[PDB]
Amino acid sequence: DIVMTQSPESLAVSLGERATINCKSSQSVLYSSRSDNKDYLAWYQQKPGQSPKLLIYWASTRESGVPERFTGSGSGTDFTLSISSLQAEDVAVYYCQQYYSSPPTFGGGTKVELKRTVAAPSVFIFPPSDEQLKSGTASVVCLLNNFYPREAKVQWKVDNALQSGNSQESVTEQDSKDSTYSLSSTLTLSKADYEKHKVYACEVTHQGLSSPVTKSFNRGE
Amino acid sequence: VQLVESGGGVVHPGRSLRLSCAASGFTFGTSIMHWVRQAPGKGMQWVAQISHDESRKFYSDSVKGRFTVSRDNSKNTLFLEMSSLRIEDTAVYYCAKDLSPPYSYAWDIFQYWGQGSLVTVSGASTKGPSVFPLAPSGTAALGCLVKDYFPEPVTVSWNSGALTSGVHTFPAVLQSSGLYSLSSVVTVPSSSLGTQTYICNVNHKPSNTKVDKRVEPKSC
């Protein structure tokens, strides 16, 4: 019945800098016995798609092989996970967990992001394929590749007319090597409508672009 | 140390499903094992605990009476029998080893985890994807659009796994149709398009779909 609460939901810090993750238990997880007092709390690291890994437990004790830059501290009701010098490979979601009472419960997680230099996106546009147009539907895709930060505005235009509601976005997780993002934007259209307009354009706005970038094509050429 | 969960997929509400977890690298027979799950965009939730000899079993009140944890120590395999499944049971299910030493009660410290197995519970029809090329027209971008499939997930490789640099498979997006859509892209030297063949290998296991679409460049 113990509720764990983590703060903040996400943080971004530069290479070599300190990341701080706070965790609060609804009830004290400090257990008293004949031996020393121990805080029944553990920390875990989870990269997308990969097996979670035990980092710390008893609040402060490092698991074998965990680098010393990971430091667990706190007592009773307040706890902190400290990353002395963040590395790209450190990008992950971190969760705390109490095992003082049953059932064991976890925090909501904190996303740790690496704040790297600004990188402008490489923009590409893809018309619907002849295969799909034969199938009766039409999808126009716009790719923003290897950019940072994540924030970016994609606006579709059909014959210079701005689009809204007919597109959907998807963003990759921060890369493990260059710590960049990639974004897809899909304009879904009906075949009949697609054939009535000529120029399709994807205009991108980003912190790394001095001015909006445009990638477009003409349907029939 | 390896924990590999298998089984899992889509099931209609009310039906059952059995997960398995093959273990190696530790004395499985003498260690306490757990099941922990993670619902979409939420935190971990402990599900079940089982002792070395199965004499002591424990379940989360959220699954009590519906799930059964068992194990076969001769084959170093952990089992989770899930019955009367509900929409809220949709999650990636992890197999985990407890840090407690042999013959001691559980520490509830999850020393080792598996990579997890996705369990989907929906009364929605399974459907495979349609794979269309994102044709390229000193670096050129190729891709494949994987459209109108359900339930998740699909996995995309390029050139039977030989091409992995510059690949970005985007997370699925649910359309107003209720079907998922996904894209996978790859950047490649522009000078290889006329000679090198690029084939996206899409795999959607729920529907038993496995497509190899060759992406041809546009030349003008």
Residue numbers in the entry:
A (entry chain L): 1 to 221
B (entry chain H): 2 to 138, 145 to 227
Authors' description from the paper:
The arenavirus surface glycoprotein complex (GPC) is the target of neutralizing antibodies. GPC comprises three functional subunits: the stable signal peptide (SSP), GP1, and GP2.9 GP1 binds cellular receptor(s), and GP2 contains a transmembrane domain (TM) and mediates membrane fusion. During attachment of New World arenaviruses to their cellular receptor transferrin receptor 1 (TfR1),10–12 a GP1 pocket accepts a tyrosine (Tyr211TfR1) that is conserved in all TfR1 orthologs that can support the entry of these viruses. We determined X-ray crystal structures of JUNV GP1 with the weakly cross-reactive antibody Fab and of MACV GP1 with the potently cross-neutralizing antibody Fab.
CR1-07, however, bound to JUNV and MACV GP1 equivalently in an ELISA and potently cross-neutralized MACV pseudotype. Its affinity for MACV GP1 as measured by SPR was 16 nM. CR1-07 reduced plaques for infectious JUNV and MACV. We therefore determined a high-resolution (2.0 Å) structure of the unliganded CR1-07 Fab and used that structure, along with MACV GP1, as search models for molecular replacement. For the MACV complex, our model is further supported by the high-resolution structure of the unliganded CR1-07 Fab we used for molecular replacement.
